[PDB]
Design an enzyme around this catalytic site. Structure first.
Site, PDB file in Angstrom:
ATOM      1  N   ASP A   1      47.027 -34.053  -9.491  1.00 54.96           N
ATOM      2  CA  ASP A   1      46.964 -32.827  -8.704  1.00 54.96           C
ATOM      3  C   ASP A   1      48.294 -32.455  -8.050  1.00 54.96           C
ATOM      4  O   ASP A   1      48.310 -31.728  -7.057  1.00 54.96           O
ATOM      5  CB  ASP A   1      45.903 -32.963  -7.615  1.00 54.96           C
ATOM      6  CG  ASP A   1      46.209 -34.096  -6.646  1.00 54.96           C
ATOM      7  OD1 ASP A   1      46.544 -35.206  -7.115  1.00 54.96           O
ATOM      8  OD2 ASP A   1      46.140 -33.869  -5.421  1.00 54.96           O
TER       9      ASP A   1
ATOM     10  N   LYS B   1      40.028 -32.837  -2.849  1.00 58.42           N
ATOM     11  CA  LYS B   1      40.948 -33.718  -2.156  1.00 58.42           C
ATOM     12  C   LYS B   1      41.701 -32.923  -1.105  1.00 58.42           C
ATOM     13  O   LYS B   1      42.071 -31.767  -1.316  1.00 58.42           O
ATOM     14  CB  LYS B   1      41.927 -34.385  -3.127  1.00 58.42           C
ATOM     15  CG  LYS B   1      43.217 -34.866  -2.467  1.00 58.42           C
ATOM     16  CD  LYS B   1      44.045 -35.735  -3.388  1.00 58.42           C
ATOM     17  CE  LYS B   1      45.522 -35.618  -3.044  1.00 58.42           C
ATOM     18  NZ  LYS B   1      46.387 -36.467  -3.912  1.00 58.42           N
TER      19      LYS B   1
ATOM     20  N   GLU C   1      41.272 -38.108   2.842  1.00 59.76           N
ATOM     21  CA  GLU C   1      42.502 -38.880   2.674  1.00 59.76           C
ATOM     22  C   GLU C   1      43.363 -38.856   3.928  1.00 59.76           C
ATOM     23  O   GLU C   1      44.186 -37.957   4.099  1.00 59.76           O
ATOM     24  CB  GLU C   1      43.326 -38.351   1.494  1.00 59.76           C
ATOM     25  CG  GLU C   1      44.645 -39.103   1.277  1.00 59.76           C
ATOM     26  CD  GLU C   1      45.469 -38.562   0.115  1.00 59.76           C
ATOM     27  OE1 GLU C   1      45.029 -37.590  -0.537  1.00 59.76           O
ATOM     28  OE2 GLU C   1      46.560 -39.115  -0.148  1.00 59.76           O
TER      29      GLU C   1
ATOM     30  N   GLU D   1      46.226 -40.592   4.895  1.00 58.92           N
ATOM     31  CA  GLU D   1      47.259 -41.516   4.446  1.00 58.92           C
ATOM     32  C   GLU D   1      48.199 -41.893   5.571  1.00 58.92           C
ATOM     33  O   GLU D   1      48.821 -41.030   6.191  1.00 58.92           O
ATOM     34  CB  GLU D   1      48.087 -40.938   3.297  1.00 58.92           C
ATOM     35  CG  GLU D   1      49.303 -41.818   2.978  1.00 58.92           C
ATOM     36  CD  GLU D   1      50.016 -41.441   1.694  1.00 58.92           C
ATOM     37  OE1 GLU D   1      49.736 -40.355   1.142  1.00 58.92           O
ATOM     38  OE2 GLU D   1      50.864 -42.241   1.238  1.00 58.92           O
TER      39      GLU D   1
ATOM     40  N   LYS E   1      39.818 -42.033   0.946  1.00 58.74           N
ATOM     41  CA  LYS E   1      41.036 -42.331   0.214  1.00 58.74           C
ATOM     42  C   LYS E   1      42.110 -42.787   1.183  1.00 58.74           C
ATOM     43  O   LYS E   1      42.921 -41.986   1.638  1.00 58.74           O
ATOM     44  CB  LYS E   1      41.501 -41.107  -0.584  1.00 58.74           C
ATOM     45  CG  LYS E   1      42.819 -41.294  -1.322  1.00 58.74           C
ATOM     46  CD  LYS E   1      43.074 -40.162  -2.315  1.00 58.74           C
ATOM     47  CE  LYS E   1      44.373 -40.369  -3.083  1.00 58.74           C
ATOM     48  NZ  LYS E   1      44.707 -39.211  -3.974  1.00 58.74           N
TER      49      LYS E   1
ATOM     50  N   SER F   1      42.371 -44.226  -6.660  1.00 55.73           N
ATOM     51  CA  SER F   1      42.685 -42.824  -6.880  1.00 55.73           C
ATOM     52  C   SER F   1      44.190 -42.742  -7.053  1.00 55.73           C
ATOM     53  O   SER F   1      44.916 -42.434  -6.109  1.00 55.73           O
ATOM     54  CB  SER F   1      42.215 -41.945  -5.720  1.00 55.73           C
ATOM     55  OG  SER F   1      42.653 -40.604  -5.892  1.00 55.73           O
TER      56      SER F   1
ATOM     57  N   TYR G   1      43.143 -62.166  11.407  1.00 57.03           N
ATOM     58  CA  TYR G   1      43.275 -60.722  11.218  1.00 57.03           C
ATOM     59  C   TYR G   1      42.473 -59.944  12.259  1.00 57.03           C
ATOM     60  O   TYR G   1      42.732 -58.766  12.498  1.00 57.03           O
ATOM     61  CB  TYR G   1      42.814 -60.332   9.808  1.00 57.03           C
ATOM     62  CG  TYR G   1      43.639 -60.966   8.708  1.00 57.03           C
ATOM     63  CD1 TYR G   1      43.498 -62.313   8.394  1.00 57.03           C
ATOM     64  CD2 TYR G   1      44.559 -60.217   7.983  1.00 57.03           C
ATOM     65  CE1 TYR G   1      44.257 -62.899   7.394  1.00 57.03           C
ATOM     66  CE2 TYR G   1      45.320 -60.795   6.976  1.00 57.03           C
ATOM     67  CZ  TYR G   1      45.163 -62.136   6.687  1.00 57.03           C
ATOM     68  OH  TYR G   1      45.914 -62.720   5.692  1.00 57.03           O
TER      69      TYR G   1
END
Ligand SMILES: O=P(O)(O)C(c1ccc2cc(O)ccc2c1)P(=O)(O)O
Ligand SMILES: O=P(O)(O)C(c1ccc2cc(O)ccc2c1)P(=O)(O)O
Ligand SMILES: O=P(O)(O)C(c1ccc2cc(O)ccc2c1)P(=O)(O)O
Ligand SMILES: O=P(O)(O)C(c1ccc2cc(O)ccc2c1)P(=O)(O)O
Lengths: 344, 350, 349, 351
Positions: B33, B146, B187, B189, B229, B300, B350
């Site tokens: 995309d 998206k 998403e 990010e 995502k 993805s 963690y």
């Protein structure tokens, strides 16, 4: 955007291990933490005087049941008084609990208070000096705690304020507990009061829990070292429509799946107004629900473990064994229910 | 505190069915995309002119790869232009994708814009007329979308403002998509830029994701009809310290377990700056991680599926088979990785 | 907790200067920014065809009224189309406005859209490419902007989501405007629709405005370079309980005093469903309210400035002056009202 | 979206009247509410034993100053102990305060506690049984209260959590106070510690105050029945750059104008680390600042009213008048400052 770790790896391990012991397979929690004012009513209901001795005796009755409960009971929640009482053989009740393989819990909240500007909504108090109390309870054998917030489904409730405030105080309580090596049970109870239907309860439960875990996130709570104690998703007490145990189970598991992060170690349902049997059947249905459930789904029952025992006892020393038998009955039923193996 | 259902049961089933098809076991997403301005950088880097035809041919190259990718690719994200392009045989690209067993996706955001008063942070635009666009895309064969928000780890970032604003715009986008029968890929990010270590990334990722899902709740998003995502949890590009794939895996799964409700149907990782092989290895470690993961953990990938194919192609028609072969190899590798079966050749810390 | 200044001192001064010019004493805003679809309704109501020429002519009618309006009108909000139209003498309308001492404003939002999962609530769109449009509008003579959010008082509205979402989009819009030297007018309009009473409106208004200014703070908005365009606090259109203009004024000023920081340069009321006279009387009562008001309290009126002019015009060129006279009449009335000079139990709130 | 009024009109009027009396023109607040552990440090610094009697005597010293303070002091904040102590003539201290025209206040918080997961940040406790305490205090002569939250300017502070939590607990405290007819003083103190400059403090103060008043709104607080007790906007103690009193005033007034709704009845500044004189000069500069200020701008000073009196006393009864004289001197100076009338003789867009 900078981490200042609330907990060390060693502290994290301790909390996680405690949390896991409590909700180990087949195990749940006996909630025997009724305040003096709350247990009074129960004794009154069997025509028994509310004395320290009768409270001591009744608690002894529950805590000293035969070893058939040992694999059923991972934890026992006590009220402050009971934590420092002793059985007839001189053993402190916490020692009795541990010797039967149970973890000791302590109720640490100090009841609800009104929120001004709301339609009869409340928050919960008990944070003052909570850190010192937790340190002391820890020394005296307690490894987890309980804090109860209460929400009401009405025309204008639970309000944004009530949800936000209760989620926040729960997060504060959970934070202080974990600093002192105590596993917090987070209890955002939505009362069954009202004529609302199942999906209204599911909607409210989802919104409450989303707020709760955002709050816990904002306060840097270690979820693996926590437990959740929610209401099951059910219609209101006055709702005329009827639902099967599978529908209740589906709505409950769905609400949890949409809000409760997998890292949460376990969910210990409160029984609310449900009968002993009703509570066991629903819990069984929940554990049989085919959807994926990444946390233990078990019980933290007070009435649903005690109702019959209290009646069979009737305040009479000679009915000790009879009363205990009723308790063992429910503990065994619910140990199966939380494995999805209960058949009445 | 009163429900005015955003979706009917039928709308819900459709979104859920779509979401599950995309991330079915062994399957992931080809991210093709890239905007015209973005693909421009790709073509130039192989000395190829950025024309509509070369863009059409390159996309054709990927979408018409042989049937070995069919069980590998559950979805393909297209940029607007490509959605309405055709293969040499006259077949619309969406038909090409569907005939190979894939779901068609559409990127719907309109890029980042600066947030005033911040240290170079951004939000994303593209909501205006989004409902109409989604209906049109749906009609024209798209079943998911998206939307990319970008956050950066720095001394004073990501700020409270940036986190809140980006989470909220993501929720708005997701709401609009779901009203039009489109599954939104959310998403958020977090860029790998900087010298931060692994646990800093894990902390920020956890905070970003908690904000994301609170926002999705506030906007009444149907989680079973969404995909996430996220970045993998990794150290920053400039971090000198070194970590194993298992630590990367552990940190990633841990962050997700602490923030992503089980109802979320799947997690489709972006590869970011990772190499083709690195992205596959990390994804494999994530699926082998022994902790409980109640969602699909797959890919993805854009660069991590295309890098080698693009180079083998070189803008030359005669390098078709060689180029497609490189793409198929990565598609096959990642289908194995998202099952934890790929070979390249617990801790409370963690 | 670290400052990364959104604006330089020079940018701040410009925005502040603009804001102060618009709401200078005795002055208010003519809202002539009706979209083509909205002005369609007005032309239709006077049996006039909705053509570009009739729209141009009607706008010309208002903008070229005699110099009696000059001290009354500090600003004029235009719709995009009108910003690029010209008067009969060839002058671009922005130039016509400025020559009469007015500031030029531009409506930049792109209308309401439904919020899924709510009982008919909306948010507003128009952020995409807004920075470029603002930069262009600035070049073409615009110094402030308008963005309209709409909230509804109902059984379960305005919801938490609606208040949060609309406040946040208003803040985004204000931020983008200020980066381009445009003063943003923040309009969180609470509709008068319904049978709710005065104190419910006051409650909702207080909660909405608290949300708005928290959002403006979170987005680092420079308040001195903004204006607020709120509803007055009034009962619903269908409310059976009756109130005086003094009660409306008291409830309005109280709500603002409890939520609007003093740093905000001015409050420019929308007239909503009020008549021309009602809008003026209420605005006058608001300015007569004895409580302390640290911002200009004036008007951003559409219907309340235009209703009579529009009817007097009736689509006939020969009725120009008659129509203009009606507008001048209202401009003068409201110029007096926003100074408390117009003549046609505080804890209870 | 529905109002369930927290307060009746009569309750609102009571709270508003109290708030206005405290900050009436020329008046401010004497902060004498140092806990026993906090006052211990002050007595030690003048070589005096920390006994109940010495604490009683010292508080008596301040509260029984001559009638020159009467128009200076609108309110006196007491610590629990002092509220129930008496003057030599048997009069309860609250009656002494009232007879001199003052309103009686009580500090009700129970100190700061650490917030886990933060860089040494805190919130404040004291809500448990607060309603009952407030009802009792009201009965025993108190009409307003004080609750202190502390925030620190550092590299990563004040964090979002710290701001949110402290704002929320302040709102809870204010809500409980107003239900019991007590005017709450909201004190979100930003410490002067550090090397940050003036505009950093202004920025943080603005963010803190915006959060405070959003929280108060969410909890349905009646602002007209509240007072704000903020830090002045100043550079950090360790800041090398220097600023005039005019700049401090401008930054302080600017921050308030951008965050504090006009409905707030008054702002009673804390002096923090400022000297007695510095505190008066700054307060005076604040009141002369030409910008529009729709709230009373006065003082709630502890150290800035007591520092000199305490040293002149030295724990010796024979120095009573001398010690009192120092206190009266500061009370008069600050009464002038909060009117912008204090003389030692007795760009706007840059912010
Ligand atoms: O009649 P009772 O004593 O009130 C009885 C009851 C009710 C609530 C109870 C709550 C408890 O925590 C423990 C025992 C209970 C027992 P029920 O209502 O189930 O009959
Ligand atoms: O030569 P480039 O353009 O930098 C190449 C590259 C980089 C980013 C890319 C991003 C894509 O979405 C698709 C292909 C890419 C290809 P790489 O960095 O992987 O070699
Ligand atoms: O007959 P109409 O078109 O409805 C007329 C009217 C109504 C709304 C109006 C709104 C405007 O912004 C400008 C003029 C208007 C004029 P009114 O109702 O006030 O007479
Ligand atoms: O010598 P000390 O006791 O520390 C004195 C001082 C410091 C803080 C004080 C704080 C008070 O609230 C009341 C009196 C104080 C007096 P300073 O530091 O101003 O000289």
């Amino acid at each position: 955007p900078h981490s200042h770790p609330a907990l060390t790896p060693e502290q994290k391990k301790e909390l996680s291990d405690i949390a896991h012991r409590i909700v180990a397979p087949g195990k749940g929690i006996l909630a025997a933490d009724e305040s003096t004012g709350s247990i009074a009513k129960r004794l009154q209901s069997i025509g028994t005087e509310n004395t320290e001795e009768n409270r001591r005796f009744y608690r002894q009755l529950l805590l000293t049941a035969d070893d058939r409960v040992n694999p059923c009971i991972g934890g026992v929640i006590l009220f402050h008084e009971t934590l420092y009482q002793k059985a007839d053989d001189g053993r402190p009740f916490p020692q009795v609990i541990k010797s039967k393989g149970g973890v000791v819990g302590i109720k640490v909240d100090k009841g609800v208070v009104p929120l001004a500007g709301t339609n009869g909504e409340t928050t919960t108090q008990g944070l003052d000096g909570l850190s010192e109390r937790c340190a002391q309870y820890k020394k005296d054998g307690a490894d987890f705690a309980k804090w109860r917030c209460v929400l009401k489904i009405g025309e204008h409730t639970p309000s944004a304020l009530a949800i936000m405030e209760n989620a926040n105080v729960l997060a504060r309580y959970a934070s202080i507990c974990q600093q002192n090596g105590i596993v917090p049970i987070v209890e955002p109870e939505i009362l069954p009061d009202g004529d609302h239907d199942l999906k209204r309860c599911q909607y409210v439960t989802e919104k409450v829990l989303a707020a709760v875990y955002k709050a816990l996130s904002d306060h840097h709570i270690y979820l693996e070292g926590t437990l959740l104690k929610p209401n099951m998703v059910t219609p209101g007490h006055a709702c005329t429509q009827k639902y099967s145990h599978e529908e209740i189970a589906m709505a409950t598991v769905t609400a949890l799946r949409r809000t409760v992060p997998p890292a949460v170690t376990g969910v210990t349902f409160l029984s609310g107004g449900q009968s002993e049997e009703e509570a066991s059947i629903n819990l069984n249905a929940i554990n049989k629900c085919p959807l994926l459930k990444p946390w233990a789904l078990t019980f933290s029952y007070g009435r649903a473990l005690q109702a019959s025992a209290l009646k069979a006892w009737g305040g009479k020393k000679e009915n000790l064994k009879a009363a205990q038998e009723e308790y063992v009955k429910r503990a065994l039923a619910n140990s199966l229910a939380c494995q999805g193996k209960y058949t009445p």
